[PDB]
């Protein structure tokens, strides 16, 4: 068919679920890929079955051969590790698993470049903002061709935490999360809205306290962190976000979204890439959007950069 | 079943759109209501047939009698004229119609009173800020369930129009028109937004000039004037505003939505309706939102309530 | 954009429909072309304000000039009378309009195949499996990419009744009429099922008598001529029709749809076309179904096509 | 709200797909609930971010409190265990386990018949026949209003198969497995269609073939197996077919599909619950529905009733 063919690179927790929305929305053909032998086919299988509740026509197929990613639209990496072997739930983070997830982003690239350098992409493996950029180096692919999942997310919750306490439906509330994805991410308070209104007229009608707003910050920085000391593990909404961008694209819906995308001398900054909001359609990137921050606001974004650039060094 | 019971008073060109969305949505059981004898009984049958393609099971019926209200959870109200007989297209307004339209909503909120007084009830008959307080005087309703269309209808427009000219997703424009649904409409340059950013940042990086802006304003207030010129009618955007309406009453979504409702101090105004952002549930009107306005902006809307007043005293 | 251009031939009753429901569904950009002048313009930026509603990102736009057929994927061809000028409402049906009719579909094929000779069509003027093939002999496109509706509609008609007698879902009635549209189509009592299961048996248990069923038959062919009658037309069924038939081309469904199509020794038949399951994805016609017919079905199925073959000869 | 509240008795792999697409469909407000300390509130909150990215507005919460059953209007039961501990993955079946999930239903019910009386039940926990005619009898729900999975999810791969074998849109064929889940299931060859056309016409046209069709039925008896000895679980079709029970069941689609019920004279059983097509509504189970089998089919629904009754004794 000319029915697109996505290629998820990856097929853990966020495979598994990012593979299902597809099918729900039938998007186009899925290919679940991974290094453990056997275990891609029966995810694939079970997901197959949903076509016929879905009234959708997606196929879906394991594998465990680079070769599959011939003919990709777009390629969806999550392809590396979620945790360092040896490190407790309390401590969290990221620096030992550094040069190693470098080396499967150089092998995933070399093998995009050979099969399908027409193809669009979406990288998640963390460090996200240091990994994306590494694949774009080693793959070869156009600039508004290669993006990273990070604002959507972070966002997601912020948003969801501040409706819920307004009482208002979740879509509603509109805000951003730059610079990086992890733990110097800007939660800018001065871009906050809600039903398009800005957030400190809420705050003037005491709705929402400015320390409310303080402690639902703190909230959204340490979100993942919070579901890790609940006994679970981030992956539903990861997925709901990953497959958001990748619809804006297969649609050309042209969606304003928070993504890591290489900075050209927005907000001071070349030669790396960072959170910022793009628009995503049939020609990739169309629109790269530079937020016209204050003093303050730079200080923190430049934070964020010095923290990819200090993991990149030693990637 | 407990499906909802909507009932569209008024089977004409709106009513018409309103019962094919219900069915593509599968929102509940749609009865068309018309003086008119036979028509509603055919546009319901053909209407009917769409089930099947739409994977649905909504009952649609014609109905030529008052009591067929009875049990109604969700009532529209489009009945009445659209145009004045004898004035023409270049000259379309509101002045006679005015004793008519009223007689008209009397008599439909005498029925809703007997019928169905605990109904959540949307009124569309032109003009609308005045109609939809006559029929809340004379249906016996609560204050929390009777809304006019008007916002969610001229913004569509404005954000419509802006989201060409940018280039992005049209739901991705967010902007605010208050006051009066007509020619007074209050067009606030200051709340509109851009994937959450204020358009002023646009507007500084030349992506769209403030001139342009003023000539889509003048496009948004006469666009039912632009649709009569070109030998058509607007009733297919109309529609799907009441619809989105109706859907957040329906399965409570709380959205944030700009309607016409009774003031109770807000802007300065007690004892009228007008049109202000409002947050629509299962308990209806859930909260209604007083913007911040300054005081050039409140001297618009003060024009736009005097208006309302004026053709109220002749209805 | 890659997305799919849309031309709708023809911007009257059922057009305006068709431009609404691919909104709904963001299936593609929309042209609303006619000879009406300005008329498609109006309807167009009406229902072009509906993406906010729906958050899509389709444009409509109106289209007096051939030419704009240019890049079309997809041809859906309305244009032409729908009553006779001079016979009343109680004697509709088909005979002087058809040279006038064939005028039509003559002019159009000519701009298909100068403009557009590598879209998918689906023609819809009446008499149907007349007009289609004349488009198809004047156009030149290949016989895979040319259909008409017929049987989506009106077993819509059969399914939806037999559901309203039995209290189920009205998909899941499965129902065949073939051969042509219009008072000679053959409705096949032994093809249908309820939850795939034979209504012969819902027959044996009393649920629903031989004698109901044939009052239904007659209600199904009549439907056209019942909803004239209440003082409406039938456009709103005939729209979400040929949106599902159009729908399984563009996102390659592969669903089995009752169409007009060229008989190539099917049911005895050549040179032709009349209704029969197709299959309908992403290469048009991608299988034709020949139905295991008994003698006496048989003899129906020739009395439809020699009723086609009488008025071609008239065209 | 009066939106419905579901809750689901088991947060495991097959509760947290169910969570997700309740969600993405805006069902209903939904409870996790668990044994598990803590992880139920660690899936619920990574599930609730997803309501921004799919325009939802439903709460997840978690729970480790029987008593947050009051109120349910749907209650979904996978709690208890997925394999026996100290059996290989070659051997997977049902026999140890048996008297340990007797008391797990036995727990929940006395919970429900406390709390949630007028609830609609969907047991899910294996061997299912068996665990849904427990749970009916400690909770004291009505016959309408309790249901076990199985053939939705059956007939879901049986169709699928055969769909990728003739290349068209799965949810055009349709098929019936009945009597019990598990290895003595029924697959009835002759109330196969596609497109609504008796199988057998594309046999007699060599299509597919009888021997292709054996190795079909094996396979989907086989295929729970086949996934487990590929590395993986099945749990994304199981959680599909449920949400499509749940859906029929909350927004009165009426829906026919195979479920496990309580027979009272069908198949020539009585006192037992077995696998059959009903329709799901408004009012629950709404109508059973009794395939008129011949003595071939009857002998093997007799021997799938026969090990729900051996397993039953030993429970
Ligand atoms: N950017 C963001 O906003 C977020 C990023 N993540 C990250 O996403 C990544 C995936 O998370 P989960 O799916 O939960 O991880 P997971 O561990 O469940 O799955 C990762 C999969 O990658 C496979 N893999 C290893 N090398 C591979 C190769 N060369 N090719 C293909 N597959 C390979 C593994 O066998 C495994 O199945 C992690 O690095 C995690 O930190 C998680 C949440 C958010
Ligand atoms: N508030 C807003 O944003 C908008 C309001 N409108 C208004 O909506 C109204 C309807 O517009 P269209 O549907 O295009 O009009 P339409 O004329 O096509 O339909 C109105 C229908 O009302 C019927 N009617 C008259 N008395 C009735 C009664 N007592 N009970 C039931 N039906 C009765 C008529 O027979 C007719 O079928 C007009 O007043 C128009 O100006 C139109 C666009 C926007
Ligand atoms: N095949 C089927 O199952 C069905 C077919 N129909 C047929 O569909 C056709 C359309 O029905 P409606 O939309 O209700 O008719 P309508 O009369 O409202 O619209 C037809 C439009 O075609 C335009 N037209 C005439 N010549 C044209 C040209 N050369 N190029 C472009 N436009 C041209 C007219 O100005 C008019 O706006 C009729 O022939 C009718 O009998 C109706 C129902 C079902
Ligand atoms: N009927 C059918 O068509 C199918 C049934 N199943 C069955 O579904 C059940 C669940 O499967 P999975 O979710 O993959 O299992 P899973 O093991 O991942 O989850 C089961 C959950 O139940 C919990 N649990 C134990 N006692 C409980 C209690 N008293 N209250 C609440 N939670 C309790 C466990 O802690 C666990 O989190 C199994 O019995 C399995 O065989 C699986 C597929 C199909």
Redesign the interface.
């Known amino acids: 068919?000319?029915?697109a063919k996505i290629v998820l690179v990856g097929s853990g927790m966020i495979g598994?679920?990012m593979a299902?929305?597809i099918v729900?929305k039938?998007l186009g053909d899925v290919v679940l890929f991974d290094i453990?032998?056997?275990?891609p086919?029966?995810?694939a299988?079970?997901?197959?079955?949903?076509?016929?509740?879905?009234?959708?026509?997606c196929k879906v197929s394991?594998s465990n051969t680079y070769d599959d990613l011939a003919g990709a639209d777009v390629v969806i990496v999550t392809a590396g590790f979620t945790k360092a072997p040896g490190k407790s739930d309390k401590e969290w983070n990221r620096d030992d698993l550094l040069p190693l997830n470098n080396k499967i982003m150089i092998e995933i690239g070399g093998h995009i470049k050979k099969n399908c350098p027409n193809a669009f992409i979406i990288v998640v493996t963390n460090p996200v903002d240091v990994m994306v950029q590494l694949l774009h180096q080693h793959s070869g692919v156009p600039k508004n061709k290669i993006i990273g999942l990070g604002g959507?997310?972070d966002?997601?919750?912020l948003?969801?935490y501040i409706?819920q306490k307004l009482?208002?439906?979740?879509?509603?509330v509109?805000?951003?999360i730059v610079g990086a994805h992890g733990n110097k991410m800007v939660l800018l308070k001065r871009?906050?809205?809600?039903?398009?209104?800005p957030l400190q007229?809420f705050i003037?009608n005491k709705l929402i306290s400015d320390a409310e707003l303080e402690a639902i910050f703190d909230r959204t920085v340490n979100?993942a962190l919070?579901?890790?000391?609940?006994?679970?593990?981030?992956?539903?909404?990861p997925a709901?976000?990953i497959?958001?961008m990748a619809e804006?694209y297969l649609?050309?819906?042209?969606?304003?979204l928070i993504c890591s995308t290489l900075l050209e001398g927005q907000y001071g900054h070349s030669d790396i890439f960072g959170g910022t909001?793009v628009?995503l359609?049939?020609n990739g990137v169309?629109?790269v959007?530079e937020?016209?921050l204050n003093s303050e606001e730079k200080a923190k974004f430049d934070e964020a950069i010095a923290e990819t650039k200090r993991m990149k060094a030693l990637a």
């Open positions: 068919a000319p029915k598994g679920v299902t929305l729900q039938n453990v032998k056997n275990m086919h029966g995810k299988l079970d997901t197959s079955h949903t076509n016929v509740m879905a009234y959708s026509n394991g959507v997310l966002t997601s919750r948003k969801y409706s009482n208002v439906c979740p879509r509603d509109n805000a951003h871009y906050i809205t809600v039903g398009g209104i007229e003037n979100t919070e579901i890790v000391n609940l006994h679970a593990s981030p992956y539903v909404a709901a976000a497959i958001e804006s649609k050309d819906l042209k969606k304003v909001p628009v359609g049939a169309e629109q959007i937020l016209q």
